[PDB]
From Swiss-Prot, chain A:
Assembly description: Component of the small ribosomal subunit. Mature ribosomes consist of a small (40S) and a large (60S) subunit. The 40S subunit contains about 32 different proteins and 1 molecule of RNA (18S). The 60S subunit contains 45 different proteins and 3 molecules of RNA (25S, 5.8S and 5S).
Cellular component per GO, a single term: ribosome
Family to which the UniProt record says this protein belongs: Belongs to the universal ribosomal protein uS12 family.
Name this polypeptide is given: Small ribosomal subunit protein uS12
GO BP annotations, alphabetical order: translation
Pfam families with a match to the protein in the record: Ribosom_S12_S23 (PF00164)
Principal location class: cytoplasm
Record key words, sorted: Cytoplasm, Ribonucleoprotein, Ribosomal protein
GO MF: structural constituent of ribosome
Lineage, highest ranks first: Eukaryota, Fungi, Dikarya, Ascomycota, Saccharomycotina
Described purpose of this protein according to its UniProt entry: Component of the ribosome, a large ribonucleoprotein complex responsible for the synthesis of proteins in the cell. The small ribosomal subunit (SSU) binds messenger RNAs (mRNAs) and translates the encoded message by selecting cognate aminoacyl-transfer RNA (tRNA) molecules. The large subunit (LSU) contains the ribosomal catalytic site termed the peptidyl transferase center (PTC), which catalyzes the formation of peptide bonds, thereby polymerizing the amino acids delivered by tRNAs into a polypeptide chain.
Originating organism: Candida albicans (strain SC5314 / ATCC MYA-2876)
Localization terms from the record: Cytoplasm
From Swiss-Prot, chain C:
Subunit relationships: Component of the small ribosomal subunit. Mature ribosomes consist of a small (40S) and a large (60S) subunit. The 40S subunit contains about 32 different proteins and 1 molecule of RNA (18S). The 60S subunit contains 45 different proteins and 3 molecules of RNA (25S, 5.8S and 5S).
Protein name: Small ribosomal subunit protein eS30
Biological function: Component of the ribosome, a large ribonucleoprotein complex responsible for the synthesis of proteins in the cell. The small ribosomal subunit (SSU) binds messenger RNAs (mRNAs) and translates the encoded message by selecting cognate aminoacyl-transfer RNA (tRNA) molecules. The large subunit (LSU) contains the ribosomal catalytic site termed the peptidyl transferase center (PTC), which catalyzes the formation of peptide bonds, thereby polymerizing the amino acids delivered by tRNAs into a polypeptide chain.
Subcellular location: Cytoplasm
Membrane recorded as keyword: no
Similarity remark: Belongs to the eukaryotic ribosomal protein eS30 family.
A GO cellular component annotation in the UniProt record: cytosolic small ribosomal subunit
Source domain of life: Eukaryota
GO BP term, example: translation
Region ranges (Disordered): 1-28
Keyword tags: Cytoplasm, Ribonucleoprotein, Ribosomal protein
Annotated organism of origin: Candida albicans (strain SC5314 / ATCC MYA-2876)
Location, primary (coarse class): cytoplasm
Coiled coil, from the record: none
UniProtKB/Swiss-Prot annotation, chain D:
Any one GO MF annotation of this record: structural constituent of ribosome
Similarity-based family: Belongs to the eukaryotic ribosomal protein eS4 family.
Protein name: Small ribosomal subunit protein eS4
Annotated compartments: Cytoplasm
Domain of life of the organism encoding this protein: Eukaryota
GO CC, alphabetical: cytosolic small ribosomal subunit
Complexes and interactors: Component of the small ribosomal subunit. Mature ribosomes consist of a small (40S) and a large (60S) subunit. The 40S subunit contains about 32 different proteins and 1 molecule of RNA (18S). The 60S subunit contains 45 different proteins and 3 molecules of RNA (25S, 5.8S and 5S).
Gene Ontology BP annotations: translation
Family matches, as PROSITE patterns: RIBOSOMAL_S4E, S4
Keyword field contains Magnesium: no
Domain KOW: 177-210
Segments forming domain S4 RNA-binding: 41-104
Sorted UniProt keywords: Cytoplasm, Ribonucleoprotein, Ribosomal protein, RNA-binding, rRNA-binding
Curated annotation (Swiss-Prot), chain E:
Key words of the record: Cytoplasm, Ribonucleoprotein, Ribosomal protein
Signal peptide: none
Protein name per Swiss-Prot or TrEMBL: Small ribosomal subunit protein eS24
Region (Disordered): 100-132
Domain of life where this protein originates: Eukaryota
Family in the record: Belongs to the eukaryotic ribosomal protein eS24 family.
Length: 143, 178, 56, 260, 132
RNA sequence: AGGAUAGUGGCCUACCAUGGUUUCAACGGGUAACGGGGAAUAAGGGUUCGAUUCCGGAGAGGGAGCCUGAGAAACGGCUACCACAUCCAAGGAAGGCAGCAGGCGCGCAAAUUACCCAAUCCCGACACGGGGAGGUAGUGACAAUAAAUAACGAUACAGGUUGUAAUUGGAAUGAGUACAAUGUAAAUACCUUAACGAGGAACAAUUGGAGGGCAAGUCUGGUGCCAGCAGCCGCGGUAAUUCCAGCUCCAAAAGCGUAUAUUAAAGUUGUUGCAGUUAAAAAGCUCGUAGUUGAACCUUGGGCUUGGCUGG
């Protein structure tokens, strides 16, 4: 009845069974295996500083037809090269090649967002100044 | 080093953020009480919920339990002291029958309005923060100062307040002296 | 794709200076300001109530 | 670790000292002495926190340097001297004689006694054993060694110390019906009479005691101190409450009746 | 202005040869009452020397007009000085403030004297002979 | 049996047996592992965290060995090597901030080379010295508490005895600014407080949005599958309720978004409490060991007396 042990001396069989079946859960599996510590470009971090290498315009996924303007950034903490989005009408002009850009997530937590193919990060600050403050022109880029 | 000094929150934001049924009700409750923000409602909501939580445990107990007694009456005595519980409602069941409107009725801002010292409920808060009303012989400028039953009758204008026999304020002195 | 079109729209938007307006009340007064306009002097269209009705 | 500690954090102090949390980081560490650190009271605590004679830890030190403080009829110059149970503190400048005895609430009550009563003490016999050259002796609760006691004295008994000559005036045998004051556990401070001593060989013996209000409690023999030979005749002036433990409701009702 | 002072929680302290209590001050229409004037006032009430009385820890309640402090009167001026700390004696003018170097200056000297053995006179004399 | 130890003990030695641990998970590996008291979240059961105000332990660059001493295998004690590293007159000499402040590097990530033993306590030959222990101040939107940016009239139209919407006032007050007093080891600050300090009372409140979820426009102009927005569904191909601007309005308010991780949501880890014919999932089928679970049955009833607390 119910297929799982119920006898009073069967607390062990339940302890092993649950712990085995928590591995099918990806939240548990990602945490214990430490895949963030190994294969995630930030290394489990929230933000990261990196160095811009080249600027790229990407064709959009269907059915949207546009260009998402991202950049090739190499990370200073571990030397990895991954693409980051530049989100603001006309904020491609604020970022130049070989600038240090503070990146963050898309809120999808390691997943591609929307119609943008192959990109998971966005630029938060350039040269130590927020790209939102530059888009609103609250401040000016240091140069 | 030194022993830590404890602190704790007094309010809790609701789970569901935008619900016009709740959104209008909180505006309605604060609007006629002149409350500054929703935190003053989140404060009454959180503080009242724990009063129920204390009473909820005791009602699960068997009656004549000395914890249910000693803790039960000790909670009730505090509530009647400030007037939120009626003097004929000392059964620990009427404590569950409480509402936010009960204790907000006990506030300094509310009661100075009902004692007529300020024309409007918002003018009632103004008399408080501008240091004009003295309870007993101690000047209180806390809008949320809960007034006990014995402190109910001793609310009046401060003797050094310009509205209470003190000298004229800054504006009157400058103009009458101009 | 080409990066030439970045910022095309905001560049060609005509500039509009915001009209200078009186400051609104803060604190309990804005709390007082809303409470009247929503529950006291009702502007509902006989059970039809819209909060920001665009002109028509 | 490399040696004994000489410091005591404020939170690490014994709970019964009622030391406030925000006075500072450290608390008075009792020196070695007649009583164990956790079951004793530094003199700096007593003259500042209970009597309020000294407003801070500096003022107490000058007090003892003028030789007013006497513990059991002898001068002490250590601010952190570990006074303990039944200890007599005399401040003759104030003409005050003290005996440290537990209140019912478990803490050191301020108990003023007469000048005559300050000239004796009672001690719990820890062991009777033969010392060097065939001289038996007795160790009391405060570590006193009295040579040549009454050969009838055995363990768990209470003797009367003349507190001047260090000799034995009289003793109280341990038996059923003996008046007892408890000095440990959550039954600490209670006073009552023995009903039945249950012997547990190889372990801890328990003493069954009935309180003054026909209240029965069971406590370990290590906390049991005899104060009188029968019920209602204690050899020392018992503090307020007479070791009678009440309910919280009764305390509230007594509080309600007392001030209103 | 009609400064009224009240006393409570009195404790006799012959160990410090002092009487101590709580100074309850009623000072309506006044910012607060100074230590100097309180000692001048307190001395007349209790017929003691103004130099053997101590007043400190005065804080005004919320709304003003009433202050609370601690009071210490000693059986003599001489008794006060033995049991009063230096700073209070400086506050009442009964003694001079100690003149010494700063804690940074005193500490630097002490580790510098740790570099000398014997009399400091010997150390400099031997320096002259070596450098001669 | 002995040695060594402060002492027990393969702790070590000599001799002699072949023992000891393990599917009830030994042994090995990883640990983004110091442990606990505790923290976050929680109807409950639970899940994640715990370097870190307390307790216990370990370490002072990595090892190793000792002196003194009751107490150390000590590092603000030494000796030696390894790795760095300072002066050098080139012979030599001196190192150890994982103490306080402070300097470089690393990063997404973290304070002044301030003052003082006055408070707490410790150490000493000790009423007297010392204490970057400790306390105070400087930076600090880590968090938490309380809590300002207005109020009431008179006109005035609308309006159902008054809720206001505009132009008309006289008050009140702290934000701040300062005698002074208090506060303190001395100061800063708080509180009290003379005098100054509000009509745009410019002494100006912000953070996000307004298709749905989800609260708040089908308003105007700009672009025209482009720029871009959009957590998801999608919006944009010339009337865009969704981009770019203005106006209006909404939610919270000295606070409001973003990213990451985690908890609730999640009865999507299910002991409480999931599912397994067809959506993922009953071993091809029997035997079988550990494990889990295992029919019923052995003084009941009767009788009498008595103590206690509930309703009267």
């Amino acid at each position: 009845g119910k297929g799982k042990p119920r006898g009073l001396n069967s607390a062990r069989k339940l302890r092993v069974h649950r712990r085995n079946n928590r591995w099918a859960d990806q939240a548990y599996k990602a945490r214990l295996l430490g895949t963030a510590f190994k294969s995630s470009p930030f290394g489990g971090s929230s933000h990261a500083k990196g160095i811009v290498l080249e600027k790229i315009g990407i064709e959009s996924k269907q059915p949207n037809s546009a260009i998402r303007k991202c950049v090739r950034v190499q990370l200073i903490k571990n030397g990895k090269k991954v693409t980051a989005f530049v989100p603001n009408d006309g904020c491609l002009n604020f970022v130049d090649e070989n600038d240090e850009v503070l990146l963050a997530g898309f809120g999808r937590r390691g997943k591609a967002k929307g119609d943008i193919p192959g990109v998971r990060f966005k630029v938060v600050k350039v040269s130590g100044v927020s790209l939102l403050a530059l888009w609103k022109e609250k401040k000016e880029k240091p140069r | 080093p030194r022993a830590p000094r404890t602190y704790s929150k007094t309010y809790s934001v609701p789970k569901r953020p935008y619900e016009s049924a709740r959104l209008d009700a909180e505006l309605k409750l604060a609007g006629e009480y002149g409350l500054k923000n929703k935190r003053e409602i989140y404060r009454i909501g959180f503080q009242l919920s724990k009063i129920r939580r204390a009473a909820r445990d005791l009602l699960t107990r068997d009656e004549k339990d000395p914890k249910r007694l000693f803790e039960g009456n000790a909670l009730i005595r505090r509530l009647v002291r400030i007037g939120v519980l009626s003097e004929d409602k000392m059964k620990l069941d009427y404590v569950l029958a409480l509402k936010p409107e009960d204790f907000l009725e006990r506030r300094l801002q509310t009661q100075v309005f009902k004692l007529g010292l300020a024309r409007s409920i918002h003018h009632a808060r103004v008399l408080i923060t501008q240091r004009h009303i003295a309870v007993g012989k101690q000047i209180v400028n806390i809008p949320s100062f809960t007034v006990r039953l014995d402190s109910q009758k001793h609310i009046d204008f401060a003797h050094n307040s310009p509205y209470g026999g003190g000298r004229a304020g800054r504006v009157k002195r400058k103009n009458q002296g101009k | 794709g080409s990066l030439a079109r970045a910022g095309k729209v905001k560049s060609q938007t005509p500039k509009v200076e915001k009209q200078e307006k009186p400051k609104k009340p803060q604190g309990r007064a804005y709390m007082r300001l809303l409470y009247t306009r929503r529950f006291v002097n009702v502007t509902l269209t006989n059970g039809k109530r819209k909060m920001n009705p665009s002109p028509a | 670790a490399r040696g004994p500690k000489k410091h005591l954090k404020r939170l690490a102090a014994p709970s019964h000292w009622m030391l406030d949390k925000l006075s500072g980081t450290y608390a008075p560490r009792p020196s070695a002495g007649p009583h164990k650190l956790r079951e004793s009271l530094p003199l700096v605590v007593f003259l500042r926190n209970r009597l309020k004679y000294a407003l801070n830890g500096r003022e107490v030190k000058a007090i003892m340097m003028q030789q007013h403080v006497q513990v059991d009829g002898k001068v002490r110059t250590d601010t952190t001297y570990p006074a303990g149970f039944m200890d007599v503190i005399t401040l003759e400048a104030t003409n005050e004689h003290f005996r440290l005895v537990y209140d019912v609430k478990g803490k050191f009550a301020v108990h003023r006694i007469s000048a005559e009563e300050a000239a004796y003490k009672l001690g719990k016999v820890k062991k009777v054993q033969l010392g060097k050259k065939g001289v038996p002796y007795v160790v009391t609760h405060d570590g006193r060694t009295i040579r040549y006691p009454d050969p009838l004295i055995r363990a768990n008994d209470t003797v009367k110390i003349d507190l001047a000559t260090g000799k034995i005036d009289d003793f109280i045998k341990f038996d059923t019906g003996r008046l007892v004051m408890v000095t440990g556990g959550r039954n600490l401070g209670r006073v009552g009479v023995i009903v039945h001593r249950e012997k547990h060989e190889g372990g801890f013996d328990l003493v069954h005691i009935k309180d003054a209000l026909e209240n029965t409690f069971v406590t370990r023999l290590s906390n049991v101190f005899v104060i009188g030979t029968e019920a209602g005749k204690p050899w020392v002036s018992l503090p307020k409450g007479k070791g009678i433990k009440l309910s919280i409701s009764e305390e509230r009702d007594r509080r309600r009746a007392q001030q209103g | 202005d009609a400064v009224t002072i009240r006393t409570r929680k009195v404790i006799s302290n012959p160990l410090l040869a002092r009487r101590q209590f709580v100074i309850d001050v009623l000072h309506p229409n006044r910012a607060n009452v100074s230590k100097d004037e309180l000692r001048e006032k307190l001395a007349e009430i209790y017929k003691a020397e103004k130099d053997a009385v101590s007043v400190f820890g005065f804080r005004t309640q919320f709304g003003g007009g009433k202050s609370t402090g601690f009071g210490l009167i000693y059986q003599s001026v001489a008794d006060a000085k033995r049991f009063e700390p230096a700073y209070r004696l400086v506050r009442y003018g009964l003694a001079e403030k100690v003149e010494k170097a700063s804690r940074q200056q005193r500490k630097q000297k002490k580790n510098r004297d740790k570099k000398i053995f014997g009399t400091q006179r010997r150390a400099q004399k031997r320096a002259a002979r070596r450098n001669a």
